[PDB]
Amino acid sequence: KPEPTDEEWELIKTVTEAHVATNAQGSHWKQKRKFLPEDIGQAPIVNAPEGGKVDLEAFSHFTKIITPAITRVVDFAKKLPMFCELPCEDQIILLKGCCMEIMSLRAAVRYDPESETLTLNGEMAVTRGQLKNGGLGVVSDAIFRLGMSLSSFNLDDTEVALLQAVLLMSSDRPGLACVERIEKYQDSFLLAFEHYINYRKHHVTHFWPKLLMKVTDLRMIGACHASRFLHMKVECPTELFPPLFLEVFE
Amino acid sequence: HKPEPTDEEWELIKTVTEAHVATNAQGSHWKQKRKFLPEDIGQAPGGKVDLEAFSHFTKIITPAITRVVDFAKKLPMFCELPCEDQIILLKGCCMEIMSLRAAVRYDPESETLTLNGEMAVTRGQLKNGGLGVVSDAIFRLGMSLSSFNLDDTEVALLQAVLLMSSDRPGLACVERIEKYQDSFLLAFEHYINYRKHHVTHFWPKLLMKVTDLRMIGACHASRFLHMKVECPTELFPPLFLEVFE
Ligand SMILES: O=C(O)Cc1cc(I)c(Oc2ccc(O)c(I)c2)c(I)c1
Ligand SMILES: O=C(O)Cc1cc(I)c(Oc2ccc(O)c(I)c2)c(I)c1
Ligand SMILES: C=CC(=O)c1ccc(CCCCCC)cc1
Numbered sequence: 001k002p003e004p005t006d007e008e009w010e011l012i013k014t015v016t017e018a019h020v021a022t023n024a025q026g027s028h029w030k031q032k033r034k035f036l037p038e039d040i041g042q043a044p045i046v047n048a049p050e051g052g053k054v055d056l057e058a059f060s061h062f063t064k065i066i067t068p069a070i071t072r073v074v075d076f077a078k079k080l081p082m083f084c085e086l087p088c089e090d091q092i093i094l095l096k097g098c099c100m101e102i103m104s105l106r107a108a109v110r111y112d113p114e115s116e117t118l119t120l121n122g123e124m125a126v127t128r129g130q131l132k133n134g135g136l137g138v139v140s141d142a143i144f145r146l147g148m149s150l151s152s153f154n155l156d157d158t159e160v161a162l163l164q165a166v167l168l169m170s171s172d173r174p175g176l177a178c179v180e181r182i183e184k185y186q187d188s189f190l191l192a193f194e195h196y197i198n199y200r201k202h203h204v205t206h207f208w209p210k211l212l213m214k215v216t217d218l219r220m221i222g223a224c225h226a227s228r229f230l231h232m233k234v235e236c237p238t239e240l241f242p243p244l245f246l247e248v249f250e
Numbered sequence: 251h252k253p254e255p256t257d258e259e260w261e262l263i264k265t266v267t268e269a270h271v272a273t274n275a276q277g278s279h280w281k282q283k284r285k286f287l288p289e290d291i292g293q294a295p296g297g298k299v300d301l302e303a304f305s306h307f308t309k310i311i312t313p314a315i316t317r318v319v320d321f322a323k324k325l326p327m328f329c330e331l332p333c334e335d336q337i338i339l340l341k342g343c344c345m346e347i348m349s350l351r352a353a354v355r356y357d358p359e360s361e362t363l364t365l366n367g368e369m370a371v372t373r374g375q376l377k378n379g380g381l382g383v384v385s386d387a388i389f390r391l392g393m394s395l396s397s398f399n400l401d402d403t404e405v406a407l408l409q410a411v412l413l414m415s416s417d418r419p420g421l422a423c424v425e426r427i428e429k430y431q432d433s434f435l436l437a438f439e440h441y442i443n444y445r446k447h448h449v450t451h452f453w454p455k456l457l458m459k460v461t462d463l464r465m466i467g468a469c470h471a472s473r474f475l476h477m478k479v480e481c482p483t484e485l486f487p488p489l490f491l492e493v494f495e
């Protein structure tokens with residue numbers, strides 16, 4: 001199995017550092033985290049015939065720490081030379097299209113089977129039900145499943161970073177100008193990623209193929225996020241929408 | 251570097267591994283032949299046992315039980331123990347090894363456990379099925395074992411350790427058994443350094459799973475008493491009754 005080249009190790013060091021420099025609570029999150037009160041995000045005893053509405057209370061708790069998560073995704077991308085080479089127009093499109101994907105990933109990787117929750121921003125542990133009633137709905141199930149399936153993969157910072165790099169450089173986003181260039185960047189990240197994986201030596205058959213499918217799951221989650229956001233603008237009042245949160249979809 | 255298994259330990263590792271493989275339902279992918287228990291079965295509209303769901307479990311309970319016994323008998327160290335000791339050890343690890351085997355077959359995508367490698371069931375089906383909370387304990391164990399990526403050898407060794415529990419009430423060759431367990435832990439410990447898993451504090455956390463399997467085995471004993479009160483005698487296979495006397 002071909003391992004990463006000197007140049008790729010250089011690239012790997014750039015992404016890993018960029019990710020670690022933007023990944024909250026890089027200093028033990030499962031020790032300083034705080035569990036969201038049980039009473040918050042509790043399944044409705046009545047359940048409206050509509051189809052389940054968004055728990056405005058839980059939603060408030062989620063959006064109160066959403067901005068930092070969004071800005072962090074932007075800082076990560078700006079720490080990558082390749083990204084900084086892209087036009088302003090392209091950068092915005094790529095960020096708005098991978099924002100939720102990368103965040104969902106960051107949360108998924110922080111899945112704790114013992115408490116069966118996700119540590120958002122590495123400080124808030126939420127249950128599958130709390131995140132759902134919080135406004136993500138079925139999306140919560142998608143993210144939780146992802147986290148459960150990623151356990152056996154034991155992804156390190158370099159693999160999560162590279163994963164984020166691949167999600168960031170999506171040349172299939174609508175409106176992109178440097179379609180070709182961006183794809184060259186992605187292929188570079190993918191190549192370095194795969195090579196790094198051979199170096200890591202994971203104990204799981206068809207690791208590479210299975211991981212790529214996860215990129216596909218993130219794409220689905222990101223899309224469902226946009227649709228889920230539409231219901232939020234309908235049920236959730238404006239006062240609960242942070243500055244960057246709304247622009248990420250508008 | 252960490253110490254790896256010696257030549258003598260490799261042969262022991264070979265024995266236990268082949269013993270487990272010969273008594274386990276895989277070596278051919280259990281996801282290609284497994285079937286899902288009808289959703290309508292084991293539905294939950296303490297708690298009463300779902301007779302129908304129960305019947306489906308005990309219908310394949312004997313095979314699982316007989317395999318654990320076969321596993322132990324394929325181990326020379328076990329055959330050197332008195333009949334009374336063998337009976338004691340088996341009755342004390344049966345559910346332990348069984349739970350372990352079911353846990354390792356956990357499937358995140360379907361969120362179920364493939365019993366005997368042919369019947370997949372949900373947390374609810376197994377709970378109302380008669381295991382109650384024990385079902386949650388087994389599913390929890392299965393979820394925490396994903397990152398461990400245990401191979402047949404590690405599960406086999408794990409079963410060996412559970413088997414050679416010299417603290418079982420009534421045992422006679424307590425020291426001979428203890429000696430056997432350590433030989434497995436040592437070989438297991440060395441094998442672990444060979445594999446080299448990417449899970450921080452792998453060894454410590456795995457050993458802890460052994461303690462969880464201990465609790466699961468105990469909670470099942472008390473759970474079995476509820477079954478002999480709610481479930482009719484017909485649904486109790488002969489070998490199933492004796493094992494958990
Ligand atoms: O875990 C991290 O670092 C990043 C992170 C932060 C948050 I707050 C988060 O939850 C969301 C996201 C969108 C949304 O509309 C709602 I309501 C909740 C997730 I998923 C991930
Ligand atoms: O999966 C395997 O190979 C072995 C296996 C087989 C069975 I059937 C099983 O379920 C049980 C066990 C005890 C009990 O009282 C009831 I009701 C159901 C489990 I957990 C594991
Ligand atoms: C959708 C993405 C954007 O347009 C976007 C969002 C946020 C930012 C960062 C602004 C500074 C925020 C304080 C750190 C830049 C661009």
Ligand SMILES: C=CC(=O)c1ccc(CCCCCC)cc1
Binds near residue numbers: 337
């Ligand atoms: C509790 C364990 C036992 O005592 C035990 C259980 C089963 C067997 C196998 C008997 C063979 C009959 C066909 C399965 C032997 C011993």
